[PDB]
Amino acid sequence: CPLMVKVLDAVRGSPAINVAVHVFRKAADDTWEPFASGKTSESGELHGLTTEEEFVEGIYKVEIDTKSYWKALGISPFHEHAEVVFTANDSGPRRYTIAALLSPYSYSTTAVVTNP
Amino acid sequence: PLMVKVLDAVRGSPAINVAVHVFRKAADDTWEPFASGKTSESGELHGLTTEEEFVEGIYKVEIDTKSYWKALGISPFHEHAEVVFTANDSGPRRYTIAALLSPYSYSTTAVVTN
Amino acid sequence: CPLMVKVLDAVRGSPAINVAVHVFRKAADDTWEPFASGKTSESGELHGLTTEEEFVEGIYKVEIDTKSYWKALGISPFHEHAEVVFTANDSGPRRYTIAALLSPYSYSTTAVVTNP
Amino acid sequence: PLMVKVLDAVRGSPAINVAVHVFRKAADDTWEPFASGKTSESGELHGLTTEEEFVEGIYKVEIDTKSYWKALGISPFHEHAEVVFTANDSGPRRYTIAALLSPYSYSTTAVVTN
Ligand SMILES: Cc1n[nH]c(C)c1CCCOc1ccccc1F
Ligand SMILES: Cc1n[nH]c(C)c1CCCOc1ccccc1F
């Protein structure tokens, strides 16, 4: 898949399941257009967000709904969300994995970018 | 009441002269400029706000990571790093937002103390 | 596999390939006995370290040879290695993934623990 | 010349009263005790060594993370967090080892300055 999101829970030592993720793409007029969305699976993964045709060059924002996740668990966290913003596909199509590792007051994120 | 600290995981150093913009969420859900500055030689940015001005609300701290890496001659992944949070009066009074930067990754934490 | 190690490179945005990993287990006499070893694949993964029979309860140390990795790449890093030390299987068999995300002066590690 | 800073990613606070042991690698490859202490109210441990004693070599900083979490009534994954590194005179002079703790994860960085 050209875009995959993986989310882990640093408190539980587990995938972060049922995490809402919203992806936006910056439009010609500088606003953030809704691009795709979904929820992580029981493995903490979200596949199927887009296609190689649809996933054209642009500036994309992957918003990971960490507060909704921590509060669905009955916990009060620090951040509203974790946002990951990046230019994609500007040297041709690539495959992107965005990983996030979550704690109530902290997160870390990395990208793995591969050329098919 | 608000401090930002930025570190460089490639060089093992403070991240110096990084632009940081702070925004407050307005009633209409847009982000309005609140505070900004450049990190110091110690990677810190102090003096952003005062207790009087830093009322409860949703704040966004945008760290211009892309320019930092480019100035070092390194191509990075992210446009910027964003830290978005609610300031809450029933919590401790001083907020430190720390970020640890790599070209394709970052870590951020909050230290909230009294 | 009951024990898997995944290593990522935060500088490259890629799996960390050809990373040596040594696993030790603490003996009755408090020394660190060699348990297993291997190298990460082109996906940054190392499988096949042990079997459920062999992977008994104990205190295990997963040593990730980060300095050898960064210097094989011609780079001078801060740490000698990254060590991950944990009690395993003390409530019965579990499956462990140890993940590490590497930079020259920093690393982060997490565990995912699942019950088969 | 050596400082250790420990933060808690669950509570958003310094990690207070954490035991830290520093070791120096001996000629025979064993680890010999060098310095130890407990983090302060600010999560910091200063006063470990002096410039005179902190010669080039391989050092290990062991942070007793398991006891910290247990005292909070949380079951953690790791026995401890280990940070192993070479002190090198041709590098800057002051080393700060920072660690950010969660029950099943930790992050560590080095800030080496002059
Ligand atoms: C370890 C870590 N991973 N991710 C983050 C975010 C941090 C904390 C940043 C290091 O904190 C320091 C704070 C003040 C001075 C020196 C320091 F190294
Ligand atoms: C170590 C780390 N710190 N911060 C981040 C972000 C990561 C990488 C997380 C990805 O790790 C996994 C990937 C697949 C399965 C299990 C895994 F733990």
Side-chain angles (χ1 to χ4, degrees):
Chain A
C1 230
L3 182 58
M4 193 265 269
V5 180
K6 172 142 191 98
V7 188
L8 293 182
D9 179 328
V11 173
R12 293 172 152 229
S14 68
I17 73 167
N18 291 327
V19 178
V21 178
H22 296 250
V23 185
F24 305 83
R25 180 182 180 278
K26 182 186 281 268
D29 67 8
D30 270 359
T31 68
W32 288 110
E33 184 192 15
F35 178 84
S37 67
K39 280 205 212 217
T40 61
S41 76
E42 297 282 337
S43 69
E45 297 194 4
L46 173 57
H47 297 273
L49 284 163
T50 192
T51 62
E52 169 177 324
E53 265 189 25
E54 186 179 85
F55 192 37
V56 290
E57 187 282 340
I59 298 174
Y60 290 81
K61 176 166 70 165
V62 175
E63 195 161 60
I64 307 172
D65 293 335
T66 59
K67 181 179 181 163
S68 289
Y69 172 80
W70 293 116
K71 287 188 75 151
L73 291 170
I75 308 300
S76 319
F78 182 73
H79 301 93
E80 292 301 302
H81 43 59
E83 307 169 298
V84 179
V85 183
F86 59 103
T87 301
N89 308 304
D90 64 330
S91 307
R94 299 294 183 272
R95 298 180 177 172
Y96 297 85
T97 300
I98 304 297
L101 178 58
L102 304 185
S103 301
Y105 283 75
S106 181
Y107 62 88
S108 58
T109 186
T110 200
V112 177
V113 183
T114 71
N115 189 341
Chain B
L2 184 59
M3 191 263 283
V4 181
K5 175 173 190 61
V6 193
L7 298 177
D8 176 331
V10 170
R11 297 194 302 159
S13 72
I16 306 164
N17 204 31
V18 182
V20 179
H21 297 252
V22 186
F23 305 86
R24 195 186 182 274
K25 202 178 212 186
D28 69 1
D29 273 348
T30 64
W31 291 108
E32 69 173 44
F34 181 78
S36 63
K38 294 269 253 182
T39 59
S40 74
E41 282 283 337
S42 68
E44 290 176 349
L45 180 56
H46 295 255
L48 285 164
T49 189
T50 60
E51 296 213 307
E52 217 78 289
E53 309 171 289
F54 193 55
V55 298
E56 294 185 303
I58 299 180
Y59 294 83
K60 177 175 65 166
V61 174
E62 180 164 68
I63 304 176
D64 183 3
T65 62
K66 190 174 184 181
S67 299
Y68 173 77
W69 293 117
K70 281 171 53 188
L72 290 168
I74 294 166
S75 191
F77 179 70
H78 299 93
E79 289 296 297
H80 44 69
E82 298 266 64
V83 179
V84 183
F85 65 97
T86 293
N88 156 229
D89 280 351
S90 22
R93 330 273 149 85
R94 300 169 206 161
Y95 297 73
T96 296
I97 300 296
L100 178 62
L101 309 183
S102 302
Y104 282 75
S105 181
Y106 62 89
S107 177
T108 189
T109 200
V111 188
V112 186
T113 60
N114 271 324
Chain C
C1 230
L3 182 58
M4 193 265 269
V5 180
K6 172 142 191 98
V7 188
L8 293 182
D9 179 328
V11 173
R12 293 172 152 229
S14 68
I17 73 167
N18 291 327
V19 178
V21 178
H22 296 250
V23 185
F24 305 83
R25 180 182 180 278
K26 182 186 281 268
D29 67 8
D30 270 359
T31 68
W32 288 110
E33 184 192 15
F35 178 84
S37 67
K39 280 205 212 217
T40 61
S41 76
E42 297 282 337
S43 69
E45 297 194 4
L46 173 57
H47 297 273
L49 284 163
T50 192
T51 62
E52 169 177 324
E53 265 189 25
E54 186 179 85
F55 192 37
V56 290
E57 187 282 340
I59 298 174
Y60 290 81
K61 176 166 70 165
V62 175
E63 195 161 60
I64 307 172
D65 293 335
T66 59
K67 181 179 181 163
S68 289
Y69 172 80
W70 293 116
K71 287 188 75 151
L73 291 170
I75 308 300
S76 319
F78 182 73
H79 301 93
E80 292 301 302
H81 43 59
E83 307 169 298
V84 179
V85 183
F86 59 103
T87 301
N89 308 304
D90 64 330
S91 307
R94 299 294 183 272
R95 298 180 177 172
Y96 297 85
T97 300
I98 304 297
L101 178 58
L102 304 185
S103 301
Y105 283 75
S106 181
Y107 62 88
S108 58
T109 186
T110 200
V112 177
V113 183
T114 71
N115 189 341
Chain D
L2 184 59
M3 191 263 283
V4 181
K5 175 173 190 61
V6 193
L7 298 177
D8 176 331
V10 170
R11 297 194 302 159
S13 72
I16 306 164
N17 204 31
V18 182
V20 179
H21 297 252
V22 186
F23 305 86
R24 195 186 182 274
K25 202 178 212 186
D28 69 1
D29 273 348
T30 64
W31 291 108
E32 69 173 44
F34 181 78
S36 63
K38 294 269 253 182
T39 59
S40 74
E41 282 283 337
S42 68
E44 290 176 349
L45 180 56
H46 295 255
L48 285 164
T49 189
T50 60
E51 296 213 307
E52 217 78 289
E53 309 171 289
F54 193 55
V55 298
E56 294 185 303
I58 299 180
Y59 294 83
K60 177 175 65 166
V61 174
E62 180 164 68
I63 304 176
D64 183 3
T65 62
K66 190 174 184 181
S67 299
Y68 173 77
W69 293 117
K70 281 171 53 188
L72 290 168
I74 294 166
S75 191
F77 179 70
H78 299 93
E79 289 296 297
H80 44 69
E82 298 266 64
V83 179
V84 183
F85 65 97
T86 293
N88 156 229
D89 280 351
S90 22
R93 330 273 149 85
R94 300 169 206 161
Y95 297 73
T96 296
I97 300 296
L100 178 62
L101 309 183
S102 302
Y104 282 75
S105 181
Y106 62 89
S107 177
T108 189
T109 200
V111 188
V112 186
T113 60
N114 271 324

